[PDB]
Structure formats: structure tokens, C-alpha cells
């Protein structure tokens, strides 16, 4: 029962934990698109 | 006179665009000037609060404005490394001398009113005349940005303060560091010297032994970003006594017209009046919701003004 | 005025790639918080 | 070689779909809270 136990436990929280490192990737992407339209916009205004 | 400002306020202008960075009184008429970081300097009337115009001759924005004893013309400098000679009368730029390379930081017309002093960051201050135009002499010595620069009450000495720590005062016949000061904590800002009224007040203020002639000395004062405003002796260069309570960085500093009390404006979003002789006087009174920049005190009438980064210019009854 | 508007876009522009510059750099962190996440997750499966 | 094999890639693969389940629960939550905000909206604005 003991190691069952933690199987879950030790388990279903590390999948919360891998929810949470989807969020971060998520946030990752969002600055990824926020890094290419700065950039577009930079390299646009080089010219002027 | 006893004249202390007062927390309520009479007219807080806001005309600007852009923070404001010095504030002055014209000498004679019920007229105040404020340049600001729009390369804009107005001009108001501060006893109703009234906008009466604009200068918008600068390029870069404007740090230092000065005008002479008469009131008749009006020294500034900006960015766009120029100083620009404004005739007061019809107000329009008539002399725009150049060079001096690099962002010029304060301005001044000594008392004689036909020459101007000038720093910049290029570690040196020059001496234009006003008929003409040309840099006559330059001033070096100072390893850093000179901040603000101030000539005594008959035209013949100088004071500057830079980045460097240090606070040189400077003659005009023979262009020597006579007086050379490095005690500072960290960078001084801002400089004013003491007017006839006070000097008598500084002997029981500091003890201070009168020498062979008797006169005390002409008297410097700086303000440094440490947060400590400390004033000085020029015939010596020593301490006589230190200013602490300022919460962040100092800005400007000013003796009262009277020559008995301090008062002084800081990063600390408040404006400090200070006793010096017996320290009993240490009003602290908020002046704007950010950073305040300069202030100035008027020679007779019971006014000063204080203007800020928040593009506000606050006039204080004095009381 | 042209050469004060054209001063001010200068500054703008020279702002903007500094800012620019900054977002890489938190860029880079939020990758490498991501990368410690997942690995831990992983890892946490593999114990179970 | 084998069964370690499929041991590793099947375990991943059901880690990357925990990260898909918390994704979809994710989801529903923000659905759920949205329905129960536009309902009492609705019930306030019965009136009007």
C-alpha cells in the first residue's frame, strides 16, 4: 500500500507540476511572437 | 524676510509636455521662467498663474536657463549643444554660439552682464561674450560632466561641480583652480553661493575666526546626490558644518533671501527648509506626486516656485 | 522642428532596441525555467 | 532492447498526454468560470 501509495500521490502532483511547465512553454511562445514582431518592426524602421 | 512656504499651494501650472528642469524668477517684473525637457521654455505670470508664452527655439531639450541683473536678456542651454542669447523685450533668439561639443548642462551670466559661463560634458567650462559671441577662454580641470555652474555676486569667481567629487572654483584674470574640493560621498548636483546678508550669519552659525582683513570669505554651498548638502569656505576649503535628512537624491539648493534659514528640493518628492545657525527648523513639505527637479526662491516677494518631472510647475506663498 | 520630431524619433528608436535587447535576455531565462520544469516533471514519472 | 524501448517511448508519450489531459481540464475550467460569470451577468441584466 505504502509505495501505491506514492505512486499516486508521488505521481498525479507531477503531473500538475508538468500543467505547470505547459504554462511556462506557453508563456515561452507568446514572448517567441512578441521577439519576431519587434524584430519585423526594427528592421522595418532602419530605413527611416 | 521670515518668509517659510506654506503646504497649500496658490497655482500648480502645467503647460509642459515634458519634464520640467529649472525654474527661475526674471529680476524685476512679476514674471517666471521655466525651461523643460520639450525643448520648450515658457514663460508665465506667477503672481495669477497666467501662461503668457513660449520660446521654442531649441532643438534638444533645455537644462539651464539665467538671466542677467538688468532682466533684459535671457542666457540658455540645451542638448543640442548650443547656448542661445534671448533678447527679453520682443523675445526672439538673437545669438546662438556653438561649439562646446557634447550635451551642455548649465548656464550663467556673471553680474557684469557682458559675459556667460557654460558646462558641458565635455569635462571643461567656456566663457562667451555677449557682444560678440566667441569663446574667449576655456576652463579645464574637472575629469567628468560638469553639472552646475555658478560666478560670485561681482563677476571674478566661479564655481563647478561635476560627476568627479570635485567642486573647483575658478578666477577669471588668472583661469586657476584656486580652491579645489574632493570630499563628497558620491556625485555633487547642485551649487549656490551665499549673498552679502548671510555671511554675518554664518560666524556664530559655525564659529568661524575672521582673518587679518575681517571679512569672513565668500561661501559656497554643494549638494550631493549622497543626500548631504554641505557648505564651504572659499578663502580655505574647509567644512563648517553638513545638511543630512534628505530622503533621495538632492536637486537644488538656495539660500533664503534673508540669509538665515535653507531651502532645498531633492529626488525625495519633498521640498526641506532647514535651520543651519541653531538647527531648530526642519520643515519637510511634499511638493509633487514624482521627482521634483529644481526651485527658486524670490528676492523680495513672498513667492517660490518648485518644478518637477511631472510636468508641473507649483507656485508656494511664503508665510 | 524637423530637427527636434527628428532627434525624438531617433531616441525612440534607439529605446526600442534596447528594449528589444532586454526581451532576449528574458527570453533566455524563461526557456531555461521551462527546461528545469520539464526535466523535473520527466523525472518524477520515471521515479513512479 | 525491445521492451525497454517500448517502455520508454509509450511511458513519454503518456506524459506528453497528462500534459494534454491538464491542458483540456485547463480548458473547462476557464469554460466553467466563463459560464458562471455570463449566468450572473444574465441575471442581473433580467431586469433591464
Known amino acids: 500500500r505504502d509505495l501505491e501509495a506514492s505512486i499516486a500521490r508521488y505521481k498525479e502532483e507531477y503531473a500538475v507540476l508538468i500543467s505547470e511547465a505547459q504554462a511556462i512553454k506557453a508563456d515561452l511562445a507568446a514572448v517567441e511572437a512578441k521577439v519576431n514582431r519587434s524584430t519585423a518592426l526594427l528592421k522595418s524602421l532602419s530605413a527611416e | 524676510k521670515e518668509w517659510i512656504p506654506r503646504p497649500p499651494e496658490k497655482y500648480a501650472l502645467s503647460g509642459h509636455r515634458s519634464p520640467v528642469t529649472r525654474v527661475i524668477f526674471h529680476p524685476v517684473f512679476s514674471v517666471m521662467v521655466s525651461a523643460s525637457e520639450d525643448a520648450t521654455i515658457k514663460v508665465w505670470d506667477y503672481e495669477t498663474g497666467d501662461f503668457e508664452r513660449t520660446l521654442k527655439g531649441h532643438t534638444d531639450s533645455v537644462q539651464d536657463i539665467s538671466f542677467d541683473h538688468s532682466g533684459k536678456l535671457l542666457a540658455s542651454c540645451s542638448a543640442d549643444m548650443t547656448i542661445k542669447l534671448w533678447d527679453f523685450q520682443g523675445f526672439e533668439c538673437i545669438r546662438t554660439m556653438h561649439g562646446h561639443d557634447h550635451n551642455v548642462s548649465s548656464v550663467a551670466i556673471m553680474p557684469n552682464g557682458d559675459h556667460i559661463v557654460s558646462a558641458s560634458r565635455d569635462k571643461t567650462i567656456k566663457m562667451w561674450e555677449v557682444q560678440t559671441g566667441y569663446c574667449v577662454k576655456t576652463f579645464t580641470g574637472h575629469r567628468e560632466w560638469v553639472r552646475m555652474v555658478r560666478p560670485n555676486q561681482d563677476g571674478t569667481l566661479i564655481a563647478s561641480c561635476s560627476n568627479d567629487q570635485t567642486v573647483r572654483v575658478w578666477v577669471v584674470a588668472t583661469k586657476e583652480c584656486k580652491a579645489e574640493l574632493r570630499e563628497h560621498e558620491h556625485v555633487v548636483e547642485c551649487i549656490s553661493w551665499a549673498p552679502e546678508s548671510s555671511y554675518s550669519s554664518i560666524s556664530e552659525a559655525t564659529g568661524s575666526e575672521t582673518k587679518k582683513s575681517g571679512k569672513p570669505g565668500p561661501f559656497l554651498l554643494s549638494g550631493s546626490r549622497d543626500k548631504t548638502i554641505k557648505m564651504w569656505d572659499v578663502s580655505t576649503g574647509m567644512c563648517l558644518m553638513t545638511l543630512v535628512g534628505h530622503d533621495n537624491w538632492v536637486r537644488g539648493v538656495l539660500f533664503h533671501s534673508g540669509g538665515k534659514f535653507i531651502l532645498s528640493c531633492a529626488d525625495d518628492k519633498t521640498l526641506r527648509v532647514w535651520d543651519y545657525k541653531n538647527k531648530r527648523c526642519m520643515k519637510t513639505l511634499n511638493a509633487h506626486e514624482h521627482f521634483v527637479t529644481s526651485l527658486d526662491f524670490h528676492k523680495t516677494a513672498p513667492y517660490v516656485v518648485t518644478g518637477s518631472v511631472d510636468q508641473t510647475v507649483k507656485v508656494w506663498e511664503c508665510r | ?48
Chains 1, 4 share one sequence.
Open chain 3, 1 to 48: 522642428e524637423q530637427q527636434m520630431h527628428l532627434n525624438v524619433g531617433l531616441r525612440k528608436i534607439k529605446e526600442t532596441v534596447d528594449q528589444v535587447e532586454e526581451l532576449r535576455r528574458d527570453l533566455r531565462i524563461k526557456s531555461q525555467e521551462l527546461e528545469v520544469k520539464n526535466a523535473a516533471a520527466n523525472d518524477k514519472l520515471k521515479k513512479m
